[PDB]
Design a protein around this ligand. Structure first.
Ligand SMILES: O=S(=O)(O)O[C@@H]1[C@H](O[C@H]2O[C@@H]3CO[C@@H]([C@H]3O)[C@H]2O)[C@@H](O)[C@H](O)O[C@@H]1CO
Ligand SMILES: O=S(=O)(O)O[C@@H]1[C@H](O[C@H]2O[C@@H]3CO[C@@H]([C@H]3O)[C@H]2O)[C@@H](O)[C@H](O)O[C@@H]1CO
Ligand SMILES: [Ca+2]
Ligand SMILES: [Ca+2]
Lengths: 472, 473
């Protein structure tokens, strides 16, 4: 029974790290990447916290678990993942793992502890269940201030980026790290196999870091991507609407957008420090050599691509793609360019830990790819499936299928679907859904999507077959 | 011996506009029907939204039972049609030998009245394919962007709010609906079978679009605006702030724009009163009127700048929740009913008139006892109405309101903020008393009445209600 450590980051993009030729020096994460299996085409299940984390820890899609929206936020109907879903936490506890959780669960108050984990520290550890949804009255007020031409301290916009006082040592990140260090120190004292999960606040927006992380990256020097700042042409209406108050970016100057990038880059540098501290503690405690490690970000985050901030009901790569490293100490490092999914984490843990079956696995174990490289999947369709069923009480029922060359997005709450040529338009600027030059690729993707919805028993297959009747 | 029944169903018609209600618009034809029938002056819709209200009206069950709990065919609702497993009063009446006819929009799925056995004579959704993509309001979005830039449409108007149409009454959709209604009455008078006719009028759905002389009949300069007009919402739920449909951004509206929204609406009500006169005079000419069992109703009201709101959205304010209702039974002397009654009470009333067969639960009650006896039919009973706003076009809110003659409590389980209004001292619902200790006893009473109602209708939200209201429970 191997020791397992999961380092789980909130809204961390795939692309920012130096090992991915990104703009931020990340030596600690690069070292882990180069020692483990790099999943360079990892895709989240949904660009939203609770749905992604329920998929990650259960191995099933939201229509099976019921966890298909964020919990405890205006205006979601949901409060918690059902205690009927034990997740890998209860399954690992059931076979003699000491499971520990640091940081926020995002799946209901007390959730890790109710499933048998030592919930060492975190926002939702001691909260009462069935709380009223958090309704962002203060954020609404503050975005109205920005629209009136006001700024916060030192000309900043604190719903986007903020210089925190004090030092790294004063941060929530430093606390999460210290509880992870304690978790590793305490596991080294035990005979029993351990399963540790550290769920980091960072880099959740707004981008809030102390000096020197706050000014490490000069906003003037930021390289803005080709889809930055553009007007959305022929895109679905859900990308326009102000779902969370800070989605009104009409007030953002180019300087505001560059600081959103530079402060985000500071947060990634601070995360790289935090990863180094935890890895060095595992090494000091003699746990690192045999440690089975997953580093993952639940989803990415928008920094003004398509003039979007944060996240919302859409499928763009900057949100859908996720960073993923899985380090098996028995295996030589490889880089996997075949697409993989958040639905593949629970099966991988299941194979590592011999977890007991608790129902369906909608994904697959990544051990064959980790051992053999991309040739494990020779002959198979290279696809990923993404869902955006809800955004905080807005129903959208979105489904995206992504091949290495194309993406088709079904928006059943709209009349406008999306079709992107990823080979010729990797920045997803031009919606080709109505372009007759793409009829063959669309027809192919529609068939692949029907096959995926059938495979996972998604009940929206019926509506899909109605909407796509021109192609069947 | 089965009676002839006619339903005149109007879209977003307020309770208060008519001259028989001491309102601003001269409505002699509707007044004559009110004076001949049973006035339900405290009628409440089930939801301030078309498809939910009409599924409640025609099934007699709440949308958690029927599944019809949002609009159909609109960005970004999940729904397309009322299940064919719900026959409604249409199939039920057909099954017992009524010739059922439908004129105008169904709003419950393409071909719906026809699939249930009605002659769907004419209407927007009569010949449409089913399972169509949701109508997504790209042009209204672009229009409101022009408004926000300071633009006006032709002649200074704002056509997402009010519009002078060219030509005459005779050129209008209203005139076409009336012509098909006249043919319906003429056809009924020639048949042996009892008839059940439903005319579902487009008017007065916003924007307020009428030809001359209705467009200028009521001078915008003379419009009396109410006490809750134009106010800043204080301590009100976040769902009232959000621009759900693009025309909900009224930041660009002048006081003149709001007065023309009223004056064009009043013109539409005058045009409706003409249309009602035409159909009633055809019923009289055909020898049907003396024995005709009539319901006149608006599916819900509509906001005209009260709490700075336009049209409708997920909220429970009286101008939306209240509906006009007149029920005329030719065997009964006229009465005014001030007890609250609900859209859930229409299907049971039809059931008692027509001896319709049982097709499951009735969540409301027949209004025949009130029509015969007056308000004292309900002596010793709590005077309450229940309202739900489960969805607004793909936005989930799960709202429930209970209204007594003196108080309203609104539960907003998508929010941290509930509403409590003192209707006796604050009938304009300006002040949210939810946190005011002086109202603790009334709030406790309303929370218990709401729990009782959710239990009665087997609403599965009662679990969450018991958590949110645990300080009571
Ligand atoms: O930790 S939380 O994600 O729960 O923090 C939330 C909230 O985060 C949200 O912000 C918007 C709305 O939903 C998404 C994002 O698009 C979610 O990340 C955060 O912004 C707010 O300030 O704190 C709450 C917790 O109270
Ligand atoms: O006759 S319809 O109601 O179907 O017309 C709709 C639309 O009406 C809607 O307008 C907003 C969105 O939901 C409510 C209201 O709040 C609904 O009445 C109408 O405005 C538009 O012009 O036409 C569509 C049908 O195509
Ligand atoms: Ca997240
Ligand atoms: Ca309506």
């Amino acid at each position: 029974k191997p020791n397992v450590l999961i380092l789980l980051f909130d809204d961390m993009r795939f692309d920012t790290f130096s090992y991915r030729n990104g703009p931020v020096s990340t030596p600690n994460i690069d070292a882990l990447a180069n020692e483990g299996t790099r999943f360079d085409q990892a895709m989240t299940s949904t660009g939203l916290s609770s749905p992604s984390r329920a998929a990650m820890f259960t191995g099933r899609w939201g229509h099976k678990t019921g966890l298909d929206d964020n919990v405890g936020l205006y205006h979601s109907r949901l409060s918690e993942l059902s205690l009927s879903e034990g997740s890998v936490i209860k399954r690992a506890t059931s076979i003699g793992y000491d499971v520990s959780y640091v940081g926020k669960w995002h799946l209901g108050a007390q959730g890790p502890a109710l499933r048998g984990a030592n919930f060492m520290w975190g926002h939702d550890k001691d909260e009462e269940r069935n709380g009223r949804p958090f309704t962002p009255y203060q954020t609404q007020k503050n975005v109205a201030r920005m629209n009136a031409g006001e700024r916060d301290k030192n000309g900043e916009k604190h719903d986007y980026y903020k210089t925190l006082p004090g030092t790294y040592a004063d941060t929530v990140t430093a606390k999460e790290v210290n509880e992870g260090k304690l978790m590793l120190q305490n596991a080294a004292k035990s005979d029993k196999p351990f399963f540790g999960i550290v769920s980091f606040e960072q880099p959740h927006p707004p981008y809030r870091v102390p000096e020197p992380y706050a000014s490490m990256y000069d906003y003037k020097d930021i390289k803005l991507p080709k889809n930055f700042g553009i007007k959305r042409k022929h895109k679905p209406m859900a990308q326009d609407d102000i779902w969370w108050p800070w989605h009104d970016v009409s007030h953002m100057s180019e300087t505001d957008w560059r600081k959103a990038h530079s402060f985000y880059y500071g947060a990634i540098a601070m995360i790289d420090h935090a990863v180094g501290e935890l890895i060095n503690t595992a090494k000091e405690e003699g746990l690192y050599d045999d440690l089975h490690i997953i580093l993952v970000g639940d989803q990415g985050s928008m920094l003004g691509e398509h003039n979007l901030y944060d996240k919302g009901p859409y499928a763009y790569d900057e949100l859908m793609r996720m960073p993923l490293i899985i380090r098996d100490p028995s295996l030589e490092p490889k880089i996997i360019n075949r697409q993989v999914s958040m639905l593949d984490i629970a099966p991988t843990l299941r194979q590592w830990m011999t977890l007991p079956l608790d129902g369906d696995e909608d994904g697959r174990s990544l051990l064959p790819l980790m051992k053999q490289g991309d040739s494990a999947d020779a002959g198979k369709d290279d696809i990923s499936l993404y869902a955006y069923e809800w955004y905080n009480g807005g129903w959208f029922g979105i489904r995206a299928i992504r091949t290495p060359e194309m993406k088709f997005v079904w928006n059943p709450g709209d009349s406008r679907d999306e079709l992107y040529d990823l080979k010729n338009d990797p920045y997803e600027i031009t919606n080709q859904i109505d372009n007759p030059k793409y009829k063959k690729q669309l027809t192919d993707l529609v068939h692949k999507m029907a096959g995926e919805l059938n495979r996972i028993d998604d009940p929206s297959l019926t509506k899909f077959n109605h909407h796509m009747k021109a192609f069947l």
